[PDB]
Design a protein around this ligand. Structure first.
Ligand SMILES: *[C@@H]1O[C@H](CO)[C@@H](O)[C@H](O)[C@H]1NC(C)=O
Ligand SMILES: *[C@@H]1O[C@H](CO)[C@@H](O)[C@H](O)[C@H]1NC(C)=O
Ligand SMILES: *[C@@H]1O[C@H](CO)[C@@H](O)[C@H](O)[C@H]1NC(C)=O
Ligand SMILES: *[C@@H]1O[C@H](CO)[C@@H](O)[C@H](O)[C@H]1NC(C)=O
Ligand SMILES: *[C@@H]1O[C@H](CO)[C@@H](O)[C@H](O)[C@H]1NC(C)=O
Ligand SMILES: *[C@@H]1O[C@H](CO)[C@@H](O)[C@H](O)[C@H]1NC(C)=O
Ligand SMILES: *[C@@H]1O[C@H](CO)[C@@H](O)[C@H](O)[C@H]1NC(C)=O
Lengths: 596, 201
């Protein structure tokens, strides 16, 4: 009869067909990932093509129901999700060119091999060797060679490709009634039609700047401390008044500072909280790791893993004969099937990763009841944030003592808390200016604020201004230095990490206040607390049915992303860094004082 | 006296194939001895919810006829086979009356009714114009008209095929795994009641 009832029956038909096709595609992808064989690659490709074709057909059918004659919020949300053209609005020649450009950038990044001139007989792929040279070397010119050679080869190959990419994506986005491709990416956080809980695409940039302005003193103090320690490690290269050299940050791009923990440790003499040897001594299998993670999730009140999960998951490396992807991934196949693919080793990192991925699985299980198009996170930030909170809670010494992995006579003094917080800051605080600067640069490139002849002059200017990282030697416009990173070269949004980082500590404060923890925030463990699990599960069960602002109200009681829980988390470290930076100069100069 | 001629419960419960919920099989059981303790004390059944009568006194009472309806549904939909419920199975596939006397028995059949590629034999009716009356069977395969336009027999915009398939795969979760459901309906009519329980000697 009415348009709304017609759309509701259309969505019911779509949901039924979609679940089946999505399961077939997911199962084929699982078969490929667990078993890298040519037959699987064929089956995966075929199912993926069928799924994409189905989603084109159904988007075309979905557009015939006008949005303004539907009043139910859930039906309108699913129809809005399904009526997006995507690349379909663009012409077939340009669509084929865009797909070809994306595929060739994927191949150039994945199969990019660079080695030293005059010794070309064997080269180094980025993932095995180049990463290791970046994370473990202490030699200035070796790291400089690796950094400059990889940005020379990869950037000089990818610069015309990226120039075509920005124009095609902007054309598609303006064809889709967006200002630019940056507005298309910012549309994930857009909430429209809810009274009070509306969020705009333009509000995201303002909120990110407002939060980063509060991030800036902590990052300045951390940067000053890291600068002083790197000055100790490399005596003459680093200036007391200038920015950090780009190739010395412990990673290829400066994404994380977690590989500088050895150089910048506060109290080396004090022990670490490494529990690897304790699990080796007690013979902890990967099955025991996942069972302990399941015990953690049942302690907080969440549902335990399905029998299917245990039977169908691959939690150990299969062997030499069978090839599998080593990256840990939580798979929501659909139709009640939840699996984890992890080549679990006996390490602390794998144990924390098991908690993180099982948190991903718990979110998927919680939102499974919701309709197919709404089975996702409320935004891109929440889904990762709910795994990161489990990683936060499991890493605490209280959790390790509770499960027996740490000695009950381990002394928790202030020095161990300081060095643990510094490690967490190098992982978490250090990625925030890099993430914000990268997204702001991409937004300005898509918006047309930066002309093509001024991309790099602005980019380094942004990096000096925001990240406090200086280029080793100046780069002209023949280089494409941003696209050397995985996410930007392969068409991925990057603000999810910034939002995830803030949501992580907001959720942590909310659950710790629920659990009545009375100490420091980093000492808080959410095990044994039914109320914390209930507060989490109320948001987890919603999925994408409700606005992310309303979900954030459900957890933390705020309608917007907030930066104060992160600052509260690192407050002991913030006071310690302020004490340690009395003699040194906090802040940096954008001039070429260290090296250029 | 000495009792023989037990009721054919082997041909209902231990059947090689079960019907789809839309076209649920009904077997009328008459003129035999129905031993209900064999079913109740079995460990093979996941649901044995009896409405209107208790399982303990089933082996004593006597009924005119017994209707055994058999179908396969997803596990999550097992709850819908009850008086007063709502959902796709109850509105469009199989409706139980509120004044229902009988037992709803279900058990997981993942071993027998799932295939790796998917078992598409089992179907349910996604759409019907109106809800079903109690104990009604709809086996029509006419195109559902959700819009003002006539369907004219061929699928298209706002016209959908009524029957959809649960593609059961063994890897599915418990909610989506195939469950075989046998509903026993007990009625007493003024005719002589012949389905009686076993009498001890
Ligand atoms: C992995 O691949 C081989 C070759 O196709 C196959 O024989 C084997 O059964 C597969 N194993 C699993 C667990 O899928
Ligand atoms: C929206 O539709 C769903 C069914 O898809 C219904 O359960 C819900 O109550 C509706 N919401 C409103 C506000 O009408
Ligand atoms: C998708 O593209 C078609 C054809 O250009 C257009 O009519 C329709 O309005 C588009 N839908 C959206 C949501 O932009
Ligand atoms: C999950 O918990 C329930 C209730 O405690 C239990 O019956 C079930 O066996 C558990 N699942 C597994 C796989 O052990
Ligand atoms: C730890 O506490 C002792 C005792 O108050 C103090 O002397 C020391 O400076 C503290 N160290 C840090 C890193 O806070
Ligand atoms: C949580 O509950 C379990 C079950 O008794 C207990 O063994 C564990 O010690 C508790 N955790 C804490 C931190 O007390
Ligand atoms: C059906 O099969 C089960 C399992 O083999 C068996 O125990 C039972 O006696 C059979 N018959 C009935 C009526 O349940």
């Amino acid at each position: 009869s009415t348009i709304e009832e017609q759309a509701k029956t259309f969505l019911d038909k779509f949901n039924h067909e979609a679940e089946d096709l999505f399961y077939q595609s997911s199962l084929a992808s699982w078969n490929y990932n667990t078993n890298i064989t040519e037959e699987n690659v064929q089956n995966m490709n075929n199912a993926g093509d069928k799924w994409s074709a189905f989603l084109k057909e159904q988007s075309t059918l979905a557009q015939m129901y006008p949005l303004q004659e539907i009043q139910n919020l859930t039906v309108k949300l699913q129809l809005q999700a399904l009526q997006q053209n995507g690349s379909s609005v663009l012409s077939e020649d340009k669509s084929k060119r865009l797909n070809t450009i994306l595929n060739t950038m994927s191949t150039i990044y994945s199969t990019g091999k660079v080695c030293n001139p005059d010794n070309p007989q064997e080269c180094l792929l980025l993932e095995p060797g180049l990463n290791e040279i970046m994370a473990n070397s202490l030699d200035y010119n070796e790291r400089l060679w690796a950094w400059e050679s990889w940005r020379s080869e990869v950037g000089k190959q990818l610069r015309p490709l990226y120039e075509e990419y920005v124009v095609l994506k902007n054309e598609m986005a303006r064809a889709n009634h967006y200002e630019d491709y940056g507005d298309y990416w910012r549309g994930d956080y857009e909430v429209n039609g809810v009274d009070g809980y509306d969020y705009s695409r333009g509000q995201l940039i303002e909120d990110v700047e407002h939060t980063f302005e509060e991030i800036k003193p902590l990052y300045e103090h951390l940067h000053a401390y890291v600068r002083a320690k790197l000055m100790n490690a490399y005596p003459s290269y680093i200036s007391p008044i200038g920015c950090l050299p780009a190739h010395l940050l412990g990673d290829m791009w400066g994404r994380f500072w977690t590989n500088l923990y050895s150089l910048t440790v506060p109290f080396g003499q004090k022990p670490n909280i490494d529990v690897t040897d304790a699990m080796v001594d007690q013979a902890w299998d990967a099955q025991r790791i996942f069972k302990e993670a399941e015990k953690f999730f049942v302690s907080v009140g969440l549902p335990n893993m399905t029998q299917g999960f245990w039977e169908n998951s691959m939690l150990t490396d299969p062997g030499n004969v069978q090839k599998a992807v080593c990256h840990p991934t939580a798979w929501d196949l659909g139709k009640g099937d939840f699996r984890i693919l992890m080549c679990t080793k006996v390490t602390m990192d794998d144990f924390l990763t098991a908690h993180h991925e099982m948190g991903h699985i718990q979110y998927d299980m919680a939102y499974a009841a919701q309709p197919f198009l709404l089975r996702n996170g409320a935004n891109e930030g929440f889904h990762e944030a709910v795994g990161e909170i489990m990683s936060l809670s499991a890493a605490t010494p209280k959790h390790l003592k509770s499960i027996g992995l740490l000695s009950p006579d381990f002394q928790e003094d202030n020095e161990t808390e300081i060095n643990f917080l510094l490690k967490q800051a190098l992982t978490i605080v250090g990625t925030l200016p890099f993430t914000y600067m990268l997204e702001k640069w991409r937004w300005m490139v898509f918006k047309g604020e930066i002309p093509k002849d001024q991309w790099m002059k602005k980019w380094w200017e942004m990096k000096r201004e925001i990240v406090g990282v200086v280029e080793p030697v100046p780069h002209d416009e023949t280089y494409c230095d941003p696209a050397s990173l995985f996410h930007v070269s392969n068409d991925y949004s990057f603000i999810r990490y910034y939002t995830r980082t803030l949501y992580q500590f907001q959720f942590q404060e909310a659950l710790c206040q629920a659990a009545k923890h009375e100490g420091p925030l980093h000492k808080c463990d959410i095990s044994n607390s039914t109320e914390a699990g209930q507060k989490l599960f109320n948001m987890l069960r919603l999925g994408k049915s409700e606005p992310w602002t309303l979900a954030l109200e459900n957890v933390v009681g705020a309608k917007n992303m907030n930066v104060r829980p992160l600052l509260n988390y690192f407050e002991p470290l913030f006071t310690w860094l302020k004490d340690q930076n009395k003699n040194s100069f906090v802040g940096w100069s954008t001039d070429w004082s260290p090296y250029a | 006296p000495n009792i023989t001629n037990l009721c054919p419960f082997g041909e209902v419960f231990n059947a090689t194939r079960f019907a789809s919920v839309y076209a649920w099989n009904r077997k009328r059981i008459s003129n035999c001895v129905a031993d209900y303790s064999v079913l109740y004390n079995s460990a093979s059944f996941s649901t044995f919810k009896c409405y209107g009568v208790s399982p303990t006194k089933l082996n004593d009472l006597c009924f005119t006829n017994v209707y055994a309806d058999s179908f396969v549904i997803r596990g999550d939909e097992v709850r819908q086979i009850a008086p007063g419920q709502t959902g796709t199975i109850a509105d469009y596939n199989y409706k139980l009356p509120d004044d229902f006397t009988g037992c709803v028995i279900a058990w997981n059949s993942n071993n027998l009714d799932s295939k790796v590629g998917g078992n598409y034999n089992y179907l349910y009716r996604l759409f019907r114009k109106s809800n079903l009356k109690p104990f009604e069977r709809d086996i029509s395969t006419e195109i559902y008209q959700a819009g003002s336009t006539p369907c004219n027999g061929v699928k298209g915009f706002n016209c959908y095929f009524p029957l959809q398939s649960y593609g059961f795969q063994p890897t599915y979760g418990v909610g989506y795994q195939p469950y075989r459901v046998v509903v026993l309906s007990f009625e007493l009519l003024h005719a002589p009641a012949t389905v009686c329980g076993p009498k001890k000697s």
